[PDB]
Amino acid sequence: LEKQNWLIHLYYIQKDYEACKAVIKEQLQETHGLCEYAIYVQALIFRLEGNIQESLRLFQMCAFLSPQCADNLKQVARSLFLLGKHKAAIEVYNEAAKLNQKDWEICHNLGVCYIYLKQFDKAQDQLHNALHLNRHDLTYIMLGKIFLLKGDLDKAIEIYKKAVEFSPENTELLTTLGLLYLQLGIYQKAFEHLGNTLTYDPTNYKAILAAGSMMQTHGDFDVALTKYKVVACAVIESPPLWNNIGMCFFGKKKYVAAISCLKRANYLAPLDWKILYNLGLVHLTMQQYASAFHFLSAAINFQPKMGELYMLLAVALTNLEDSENAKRAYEEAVRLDKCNPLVNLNYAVLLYNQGEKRDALAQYQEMEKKVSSSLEFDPEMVEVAQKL
Template sequence: MSDSLPNNQQIHELFVRRAHKDCLDLIDAECARIGGDFEYGLYVRALILRQEGKVQESLSFFQKVVEMNPLSADNSKQVGKSLLLLGRYSEAINIFDTAVELSPDPDWEVLHNKGMCLVKLDRTDEAIAAFLEATEAEPKQPTLCALGDLYAKLGKFDDAINIYDSALKLSPENTEMQTILGLLHIKKDETEKAFEILGGALTINPRAPKTILAAGKIIQDSGDADVALTKYRIAAAQVEFAELWNNIGMCFYAKQKHQAAISCLMKARQMSPFDWHIAYNLGLLFLEVKQNMSAFLSISASISLHRQFAPTFSSLGIALSRLGDIDNAIEAYKRSISMENNHITHLNFAISLLNHGRFDESKQELRAFAAAFNTMSDEAKRDAKEIRDLSEQVVKTLKEKERESEAQISRTGARGKEQENDRRRQTQNDEEEENEQQQQQDDDEEEEEAEGADQDQNEGEQDKQDDIEQHNNNNQDQDENEDNNNNQDGNDNQDNNNQEQGDEENEEDNIDQEGNEEADQDEGEDQ
């Protein structure tokens, strides 16, 4: 090997042995030795980066490889794979088309990856064509399974079964494909065939959880919830997944063990919060136990995840009706009927309208129920005996409600007339009473005016009498004052006379005293 050429053989051997560090070190050494990048070194470096999850970096190196050798179909294929992993599907499809043009022979991997991009873009017909072309180039299990899944999604179960039969020929002991094939037969109501295939899968792996789950589903649908639970317990001992707990919950639901069913379905929803089937089943269970708000929330969550399943809207109508929101319940029922003209939906719609007193609309829905029911086969009608009995009960209840309503209207009308007469009599009495009160008020006012005039006259006479009395009193007071003055003068004169008399008596007393004193003195001298 020339010293100017890189050691691609040793690089390849290290890459195959997954000695990635040594491989990258060798690539760096070779780049340094030859003085720059080389195609295979960049190619292997990009592969290692993608395996390590560094997809964006790998894309950059693959694009450099394409620049070095734009005619290589494999280089373009690797760019397309990185774009697919990055979710850049439209760009990837263009690159895969380039790879197809560059490849001398059809490359099943390029066509398969192109088909996967088309599936992601919901271009189903184009995806089927790409998968069929890939299968013609080289039948491979991944392509056959992808094609079978597309047919099953479209409801083409016969085509899906044929594709999975072909896939099983490539891998006869693949229990996962056997389980899918068994489930497809269940979709076609071919229960015995499905159980046979699932039994063969369990022979290969008696503890395959998904196979046990599928077999248990058949048993559960047949009405034997206890045996189904036994199968599910075996699967749960191996591995836990949301679908398993959903089925266990529905088994408890069938056994009327509602609390256990709710617990299982809640666990399933925690494990797979974006599975609309689980949210829907939980909503049905909440409706069963009359937890209407919880039912509304679960069913609404299911609709937000998947809006193309008519029964979810019908169940939403039931929940809204029970919550008193009949207008939005009507919209939900109409949405369900627009998607699927189901007789049970019409019956539930009629019951909701009946419960809210909308009898005419309820009659219309009962007629729609009868029309949809009559389109069923005789065998289906016999199987739906409970539904037919319920509809008859609804019709009977509706008639009773209408009679009660008419009687109520009649009673209300009679009471209305009586109340109207009472109002008229009351109005007449009020008017008479008002007139009497007005007359009494007028009489009172006249009497008050008369009393006021008399009072004014009396007050005038009284004022005159008071003036006379006041005048007389003044004269009397004057006379009394004069008499008092005269009496006072008399008294004063009397007092003066008395005073003078007293003075005279005092003088006499003084004289006598002096005489006595003189007598006393004489007596003393005599002594």
């Protein structure tokens, strides 16, 4: 059988992978197979290395040796699922379940497989089962992912709260619940959970990014700038970080040192519409009007179903001696915008400056139907009112 026992378990623990592998070719020969541990070392060890093919072969052999073992079928279905085949993984997990109906791993893996197969009813029910057998963090994460992909955060907030309720030291759960709080109107509990994460891990990049975003949103750009300084060296080339840093420097009227960061982030990701929109906005504020149109048109070509993009493209356009294009861009914007009165006010300004004063009232009434915080959109609201 296995006389050596740990001999071919000594080079492996230290990851020698030479003597332990060569010893197999010798130990197996002496024992003429049927050892059941030499093969096992080749399997799980193979899977630890990049290879997931010989691992599948040897798990097939282990299943053939013990036809009525649920763990071997589980391992074969797992070796399948490590490849791209999820239907076969499901059909092997089923057999692994008809030999053992009391383990959470089969249900969790069926959930994550049905997730890749876009069967959300079966995945959801299987993961509910996986919770009821033995609650684990990864099952909670997959259920939250299901409830986010399928529907709304209204179904994910409950699950993530119940998850963080116990074992509250997992950074992934805290950070994802904080992100989902950002996705909704709540900005307070989001800060609470992001700080809870940052207590454990101070240099958490995925949490520092969102914390700095929230900070930038409510002014106080220097605090977010320090938050970003915390993680700048860990991720020295990441478009989101440099975009947020450029918006920090654009907040406190450092327009050139913001164009620099935004252009650097745009070079590292030329297909990211947020950086293009930011470059267009800053070049509008800098009164350049030649670059602003270019970057805003790019961001339009990358996300065309937006209202502010066409407003800013019209806005610059107005200063590029092209008023008909500004007219049609404003029409596109007002058709594609629902809850931003700035577009209506700016189109009213364009119209009134065109000498019409007729449809300017229509845009003013559209804005006043839409409606409230900006200091300079307040005055033009009342000045285009009284002068009309």
